[model samples]
Target chain A: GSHMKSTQAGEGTLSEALLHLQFDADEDLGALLGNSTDPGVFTDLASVDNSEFQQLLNQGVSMSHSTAEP
Target chain B: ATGPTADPEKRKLIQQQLVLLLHAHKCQRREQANGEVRACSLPHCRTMKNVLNHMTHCQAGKACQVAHCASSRQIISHWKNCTRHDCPVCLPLKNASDKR
Candidate 1:
């Protein structure tokens, strides 16, 4: 299907998902990465899908006890 | 004992010279990794200015190129041993050539 660069091109239910489609650091990333103290920082945008990019983006994640135990 | 430095005044002068030399090398290496080593008076041992230089021209394990004939034919060339991840030439070269 067609990719949604922004809501300007294809705006609708698909756009809704694109807008709020769980754009995580796991998915969307800028050239540089930083801490996300600001709310709605990653509310919308494309995501990064590479190891090097992810390494720079995320660090020091506190895994839940239930998840870690397994 | 540090070395054969009998004269304190002369030792200080040598120290000053070395510091200045290293500083200059580092600055130059920022541009030319294979330029010169800081405080290195050796005839050989090209001072790697950056990681790219080291990779493209050093005693490395990986073969950037393969040798068919050994008659002074430069088959493989790598940058020196620079560990910096964000080096300019090494990154682009590796990415493009390594197919990674």
Candidate 2:
């Protein structure tokens, strides 16, 4: 696929899911993972298959998490 | 930590740094599986910035190239114990090269 420069993107879905991940306990993630508060954040972010971008996000999260480890 | 008032600046900084890492490594490994420690990803690495630089660079297990070898001819099978205080290939020659 060709890459498009200067395309606009939003993060309301990711921001919502992140709130759940950052705030809610592991057990609580189930409901918050895809709940009414901001349902379908993942799918809504990109309904199309896009593992490359997903991996990037996961990488950033992992690094931040490492610094945040107890 | 999950408060609604979380700082956006902090989040943006994290995003920017990670993007550079992605660009540098061309999207290799991301997260460590478990009980795995990685190294720094910078061209010439030091303790101040190790795997914290790039998760995959650390996972690649190839950080101290400069310390391990001066050039392709002197390549060592593994990285020697790098104090990182003064890597000849990284700092000394670099210092000399740029000045010349």
Candidate 3:
């Protein structure tokens, strides 16, 4: 495989490079575990509290179910 | 609690962030037929998969590192505790020479 560059070949920042790449959307996610509404938004991955983490998980699950086919 | 906003750009960014965060969540362990428990693979966003793959080669040489990127940094730090054998960041450092 060809070499992968985190940054561009020439001068460029990681943020700049990331802008050109396509990332996954929430809709792309599959069904997740748990079920809950009003889960708080994600702030930081390293500092997320257990309750907050559970909330986020439930939120994801709810979203997936909501959009699921009948 | 609700669906994403109407603004396409903002919605996309938010969704991307959510996707990343969810994948970085705690690994789900499942029991195999043999009764051995193992961590099940989480869904990885294309960007994350690409970045992770790059980091494997990058860290191998301490060259063209992606650790400088904020997104990359978050992904790396989030998975630091991961027990996945295939995860680059989770993999034990081979030697001081290859340390990033």
Local distance difference test, each candidate: 0.24, 0.26, 0.31
- In candidate 2, position B17 carries an lDDT of 32
User: Model 3 segments beyond 4 Å from truth?
Assistant: A1-70, B1-15, B21-44, B59-70, B78-100
Model 3 chain A: ten consecutive residues of lowest lDDT: A61-70
Candidate 2 runs further than 4 Å off: A1-70, B1-4, B27-100
- Order of quality (lDDT): 3, 2, 1
The C-alpha stretches of model 1 lying farther than 4 A from their native spots are A1-70, B1-5, B32-100
lDDT of 1 by residue, B4-43 (tens): 5243333222222222223323344344444543433211
Candidate 3's docking class is: incorrect
lDDT of 1 by residue, A1-70 (tens): 1222322222242222222222112222111112212221211111101222122112211111111110
lDDT of 2 at A57: 37
Candidate 2 local Cα displacement, residue A57, angstroms: 18
DockQ of each: 0.01, 0.02, 0.03
Highest-TM-score candidate: 3
Question: Which CAPRI category fits model 2?
Answer: incorrect
lDDT of 3 by residue, B10-95 (tens): 33333334334434322221111245533222223333445444433332221233432234333333333345355332232212
A36 Cα displacement, candidate 3 (Å): 38
Candidate 2 on A10-43: residue-level lDDT in tens? 4553333222221111111121112122111112
Scoring model 2 with DockQ, what do you get? 0.02
